[PDB]
């Protein structure tokens, strides 16, 4: 395709986007026009594209590309976006730090979908001068790295917003047993309000970020129960948390003003006479984000924080209702969040379908074109990609319940002491995982550049089917005194499970290294390594029982109880279990 | 030996103690006499033994046995013990639950040393009716088990005291995501003061213990910072912790009175007008224990809570000074504590030397006979046994600093990302571990029934020497670009280290199963498994660097910082690091 009206910047962007767009030998002319967000009109090889914001050029061209692919000659497309800003925020704080190459790829995909803004969630994963422990061995971003990511987004006329923490959720930093860190602490993951060394740290934070072009930052500042209740209380006595939050936020905003920043934060804080007055003054100096995944921006969820497998389906359900509500309430700004809770085990690209869904709702208020446009963004079929969710999609789950994550807890639970066993239907769930493995093995064959993430999932599902088979088989066979069936498992199925887990670690490690810096993979080595050792223990214990070397396997004599009652009121068998250390063992492991 | 004056009970005890005592063909007559704790007098095969308390018969006979072994014919021994009660408390709450056979062996050894009382520290590791999650998958003791242990001690005229928790330090119980448990919580490891369901639980505790003969119990009740600051504060607003502690303790003592129990607790609490008055009333209803390991009982330390290797040497140093001070202040009761912090990795029998030390100080006020008497108790040489400490006994450490535990952190630290590296002297420490391995290999050959614990230590020390060699070798070789030296390590030393770690897990597992119930070993499988997987990663990463498949190993490019500054003021290189999850990785692992 050839163009008239391009800037040199747009020329370079189109060189980068060429592999995605298949515009062919057509002629395109560009107009800037704020009558509508996007307009595409033309026929017989000559098209005019108009956009309101420059970044919207790239979605307009995706719509053109899709329309032509559909075999249209005549094109007449018009879109008025509901939101002035549409952002995607990746988590780089949960062990998985997006590598620069992956950040670039994501920026390109977001450009094509219509996002205006890229955000990174960094608790401690950016360098601060004079704070060598901050992000120590975490793969923290250098200033040069953050600049490179920012500048790459700016090349597509996209904005960049760092999402940091200025009070709480700094657990990876505050663990260091060095005075210059411990003196910054209130309690648990919370910094000490009123400590000048804490305000020194926070100025360091802004000094790092002042090296970027952006002057928009998310400072966190959500409310935590224990704020003011640790070393603060010892220092100062008890104080109204609202009052402390007010003290702290003013200090932070004064630092931010010094570096020219505009601050966004969670609304919580703003849900005694003189503190109410303080509150009303501060609210005017900040933008608020209202979160819900299940002068106000809305934060929606792209579900990739529940283990190894995302929930694009659930994301779609809530996106549809959230979009209605945001429109009703004239919301100007939406941030789609890609959290990574408790180890960052889910692919950074696992939620491309959810991302396209939100783009479509924002621009068209429907999903009528989601497949066609997703094909431009990814080169793949949307329904294929949506099957990435399968390890969570147990047959007959209610579709409106969140967090149900058997992908993770079936994997990590013990074999001899299976804490989640009563939440598993051993035939029904096993057959689902077995079938899912087959479906994903086929998709991976046609997934191209994304095949690697489908391979991980195919292997997980096959691993889960066999793990349930062996685990539930042992419980039955042991209860019924069937040493013959136990010997068979020990001889054939155990070595097969062990090998499958090893192969799964090798595949996951390929996925991780493709997407993330190497830092953080180590926690997963530990978890996989522990699982392997426990599988081996299970085999060994059974062998000793079969051979008569022990008279019973005490693990298998224990009554198993429900793991939690989170979905007891809804009557589910499956559940949500999303902390590895509570899934893997009933013993102490972190505690003293 | 033949006896006059024995009860049938004493007859049975002497049958059990026969393998330890080598009295030969002598004649012994027994007298009860409170003029002194113990008296042994006689010659030419005829001896008279007098004791004040019945249990002291067994130490008296140990002293006789030792005196005869020394080739004495004429014996004239007299001892006046400084303390009316001398107790040993084993930890059964840190993952390692002493099995019944080991409890019996320990009781026999304590009898011979002169202890009056055996205690078990059980946070959640005893069954409570109607609380199925309490001790769930922990190897909690049944009532029948606690009875069997109590009765075995009573057979030697020894008392039994359960040491439980009635407010805090219930972390393994409160983690269960079930309403009937979560409703019992204040915050972290702390039960909810003022919740009637909490008082129901505590009555369950006493109901279990009321099945024993003993009516002496330790209820814990130490002070915790966050008492009253979690769900309590939400329910009730802020309260003076002293006042809450006072409210709670009265309730507990009222329950205890109902079941006939006398309660001991930590003194902390007793370090507004009307609360001071409450305090003074409650103090009269309880016995207090004053702790220091570094109407008042003293709790001394037998150091076995710092990893895989004890510190009998440090225990001796503090025992000597603590004994002086307890005598000066007319203390009537001493409890030697065998804590198991953070996984119970140290042998339950690792501290027999410390135990004999305290017995000797209590009965003789010196250690002049420690070897001779220890030979009766264990069948082994005291100085041999003291070398069990070697993995902690780095040359030139100051002998008065506690917790220095390179046995644990050299083992668990990463290879690619060694967080404790600056606290290691790679030649000096490695040579110490190498030599220690040799010394312990020789001792194990002559250790008899205890050989297994020396084998564990010999293997640990050899493992540590090689792990330092490889780890520091990689840091040097990588910094100096020496891919040849890296290839050598990958080819020879890595497989050797991996095998040594596997063999060490197999040996530790034999030690564990000898001493403990199977529950808890699983956390150690996880830790060992993770270490194995990280060793494999290290090899793999180096291989890819050597072969040119990657251009750098980013892990090895990081500046290493000190791990902590705990002993910075004293100028040490070694340190104390005693939480596995902070040693093994800088990444998040328990956090969300
Ligand atoms: Hg954000
Ligand atoms: Hg304020
Ligand atoms: Hg506030
Ligand atoms: Hg919305
Ligand atoms: Hg909304
Ligand atoms: Hg058994
Ligand atoms: Hg105790
Ligand atoms: Hg009171
Ligand atoms: Hg008190
Ligand atoms: Hg003492
Ligand atoms: Hg003392
Ligand atoms: Hg590199």
List chain A gaps (C–N > 2.5 A) by preceding residue.
271, 294
- A239 in B contact zone (CB under 8 Å): no
What token pair was written down for A247?
């003290």
Question: In chain B, which residues are followed by a C-to-N distance beyond 2.5 Å, i.e. a gap?
Answer: 271, 294
Instruction: Give the other-Cβ count within 10 Å of B114's Cβ.
Output: 30
Q: Which ligand is nearest to the CA of A517?
A: 12
**DSSP labels for B518-586?**
STTHHHHHHHHHHHHHHHHHHHHHHHHHHTTSSS--GGGGSPP--SB-TTTTTT-SS-----HHHHS-S
Cβ-proximal residues to A413 (8 Å cutoff; 6+ apart), any chain: A419, A420, A421, A471, A583, A584
Question: What's the CA-to-centroid distance between A317 and ligand 5, angstroms?
Answer: 13
How many helices, marked H, and strands, marked E, lie in chain A? 21, 15
Looking at residue A560, the DSSP 8-state letter turns out to be: P
In sequence order, which residues have a C-beta less than 8 Å from that of residue A592 and are 6 or more positions away? Answer: B341, B342, B578, B579
Per residue, what are the HEC states of A450-474? HHHHHHHHHHHHHHHHHHHHHHHHH
* Contact at CB, A530 and B534, closer than 8 angstroms: no
Lateral strand order in the sheet of B2-4: B2-4, B27-32, B46-51, B38-43, B75-79
For every residue of A355-412, which 3-state class applies, written as one string? HHHHHHHHHHCCCCCHHHHHHHHHCCCHHHHHHHHHHHCCCCCCCCCCCCCHHHHHHH
Method: X-ray
CB neighbour list of residue B446: distance below 8 Å, 6 or more residues apart: B380, B384
User: CA-CA distance, A356 to A19, in Å (whole number)?
Assistant: 18
Which helix (H) or strand (E) covers residue A43, if one does? strand A38-43
User: How close is the Cα of B235 to the center of ligand 8, in Å?
Assistant: 19
Question: What span, in angstroms and rounded, lies between the C-alpha atoms of A383 and A365?
Answer: 20
Residues 113 to 142 of A: which have CB under 8 A from any B CB? 132-133, 136-139
Torsions phi, psi for B432 (to 5 deg): -60, -50
Q: Using alpha carbons, select from A321, A350, A356, A363 the residue that is nearest to residue A336.
A: A356
Q: Which residue has the tokens 């109204």?
A: A240
Q: Whole-angstrom Cα distance, residue B198 to residue B140? A: 20
Cα-Cα-Cα-Cα torsion A67, A70, A75, A81, nearest 10 degrees, comes to: -30
> Does A558 contact chain B (CB < 8 Å)?
yes
Q: Given an 8 Å threshold on Cβ–Cβ distance, is A529 in contact with B525?
A: no
Q: Are A311 and A339 in contact (CB under 8 A)?
A: no
Q: How many Cβ atoms sit within 10 Å of the Cβ of residue A192?
A: 23
Contact B391, B433 (CB under 8 A): yes
First to last CA, chain B: 66
CA A549/CA A541 separation, integer angstroms:
9
Whole-number Å distance between alpha carbons of B572 and A458: 52
Residue among B153, B289, B270, B275 nearest B219 (CA)? B289
DSSP H helices in A184-296:
196-209, 231-236, 241-258, 273-283
Per DSSP, what are the bridge partners of residue B300? Answer: B336
The answer to whether the CB of B389 falls within 8 A of the CB of B311 is yes
CA distance A454 to A389: 10
Question: C-alpha angle A91/A94/A99, rounded to 5°?
Answer: 60
Distance CA B53, CA B348 (A): 27
Domains and CATH numbers, chain B: 1-80 (3.30.160.230), 81-367 (3.20.20.80), 368-592 (1.20.120.670)
d(CA B171, CA A592): 9
B150, B155, B159, B161: CA torsion to nearest 10: -10
Among the partner residues A137, A530, A565, nearest to B417 by beta-carbon distance: A137
For chain B, say whether A559 makes contact (Cβ under 8 Å).
Answer: yes
Question: How far is the alpha carbon of B388 from chain A, nearest alpha carbon, in Å?
Answer: 23
Of B305, B304, B343, the C-alpha closest to B527 is B343
Burial of B379 (C-beta count, 10 Å sphere; 0-12/13-18/19+): middle
Query: What is the SS3 string spanning B297-360?
Result: EEEEECECCCCCCCEHHHHHHHHHHHHHHHHHCCCCEEEEEECCCCCCCCCCCCCHHHHHHHHH
Beta bridge partners of A43: A46
List C-alpha distances in Å: B293 to A592, B568, B580. Answer: 17, 21, 22
d(CA B61, CA B46): 13
> Token pair 């003993």 is at which residue?
B214
Q: What is the dihedral of CA A27, A30, A34, A39, to 10 degrees?
A: 10
Measured CA to CA, the distance from residue A91 to residue A121 in angstroms comes to 5
Secondary structure (3-state) at B30: strand
Resolution (A): 2.0
In B, minimum Cα distance to A234 occurs at B225
Chain A partners of B177 at a C-beta cutoff of 8 Å? 563-566, 582
Q: How far is the C-alpha of B424 from the C-alpha of B572, rounded, in Å?
A: 10
The phi and psi torsions of A283 (rounded to 5 degrees) equal -55, -35
β-pair type (B38-43, B46-51): antiparallel
The ligand placed nearest to the CA atom of residue B245 is 9
User: C-alpha distances in angstroms, B125 versus B139, B344, B510?
Assistant: 7, 14, 22
Half-sphere exposure (CA, 13 Å, Cβ side) for A529?
25
The HSE-up count of residue B248 (CA atoms within 13 Å, CB side) is 30
For helices A451-479 and A428-445, give the axis angle rounded to 10 degrees: 160
Q: Is B578 on the interface with A (CB under 8 A)?
A: yes
Q: Which residue has the tokens 């002496």?
A: B216
Task: Please state, in angstroms and rounded to a whole number, the distance separating the CA atoms of residues B534 and A5.
Answer: 55
How many CA atoms lie within 13 Å of A199's alpha carbon, on the beta-carbon side?
15
């Amino acid at each position: 395709a050839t163009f008239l009206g391009l800037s040199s910047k747009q020329e370079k962007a189109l060189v980068r986007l060429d592999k995605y767009l298949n515009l062919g030998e057509i002629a395109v002319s560009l107009v800037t026009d704020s009558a509508t967000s996007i307009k595409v009109e033309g026929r017989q090889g000559y098209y005019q594209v108009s956009y309101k914001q420059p970044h919207q050029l790239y979605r307009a061209l995706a719509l053109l590309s899709a329309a032509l692919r559909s075999g249209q000659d005549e094109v007449q497309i018009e879109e008025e976006a509901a939101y002035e800003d549409l952002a995607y925020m990746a988590d780089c704080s949960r062990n998985a730090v997006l590598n620069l190459s992956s950040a670039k790829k994501m920026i390109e995909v977001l450009a094509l979908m219509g996002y205006s803004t890229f955000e990174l969630y960094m608790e401690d994963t950016y360098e601060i001068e004079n704070q060598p422990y901050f992000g120590y061995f975490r793969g923290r971003y250098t200033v040069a790295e953050l600049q490179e990511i920012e500048d790459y987004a700016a090349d597509f006329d996209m904005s960049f917003v760092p999402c940091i923490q200025t009070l709480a959720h700094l657990s990876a930093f505050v663990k260091w047993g060095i005075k210059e860190v411990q003196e910054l602490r209130d309690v648990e993951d919370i910094l000490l309000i009123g400590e000048e060394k804490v305000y020194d740290l926070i100025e360091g934070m802004f000094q790092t970020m002042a090296h970027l072009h952006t002057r928009k930052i998310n400072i966190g500042m959500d409310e935590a129960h224990l704020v003011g209740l640790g070393r603060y209380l010892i220092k100062h006595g008890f104080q109204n948390r609202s009052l402390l939050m007010c003290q702290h936020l003013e200090r932070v905003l004064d630092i931010a003003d010094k570096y020219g920043f505009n601050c966004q934060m969670w609304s919580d804080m703003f849900f005694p006479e003189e503190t109410r007055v303080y509150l009303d003054r501060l609210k005017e100096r900040v933008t608020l984000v209202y979160w819900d995944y299940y002068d106000i921006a809305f934060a929606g969820g792209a579900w990739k924080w529940i283990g190894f497998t995302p929930h694009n389906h659930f994301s779609r359900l809530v996106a549809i209702e959230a979009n209605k509500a945001c429109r009703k309430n004239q919301v100007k700004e939406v941030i789609v969040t890609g959290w990574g809770d408790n180890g960052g085990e889910t692919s950074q690209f696992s939620v491309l379908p959810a991302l396209q869904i939100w783009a479509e709702l924002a621009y068209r208020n429907d999903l009528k074109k989601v497949s066609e446009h997703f094909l431009v963004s990814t080169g793949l079929d949307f329904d294929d990609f949506m099957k990435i969710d399968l390890a969570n999609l147990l047959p007959d789950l209610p579709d409106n319940l969140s967090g149900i994550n058997p992908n993770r807890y079936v994997l990590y639970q013990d074999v001899l002491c299976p804490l989640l066993e009563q939440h598993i239907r051993p035939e029904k769930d096993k057959q689902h995982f077995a079938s899912s493995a087959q479906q994903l093995g086929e998709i991976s064959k046609r997934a191209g550049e994304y095949a690697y993430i489908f391979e991980t999932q195919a292997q997980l599902n096959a691993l889960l089917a066999l793990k349930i088979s062996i685990t539930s088989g042992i419980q039955k066979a042991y209860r019924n005194g069937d040493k013959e069936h136990l010997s068979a498992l020990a001889e054939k199925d155990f070595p097969q499970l062990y090998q499958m887990v090893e192969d799964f670690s090798d595949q996951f490690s390929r996925q991780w290294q493709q997407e993330n810096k190497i830092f953080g993979l180590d926690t997963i080595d530990i978890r996989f390594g522990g699982l392997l050792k426990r599988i081996k223990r299970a085999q060994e214990r059974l062998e000793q029982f079969i051979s008569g070397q022990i008279d019973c396997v005490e693990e298998l004599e224990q009554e198993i109880l429900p793991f939690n009652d989170f979905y007891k009121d809804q009557g589910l068998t499956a559940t949500t279990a999303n902390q590895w250390h509570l899934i893997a063992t009933a013993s102490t492991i972190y505690t003293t």
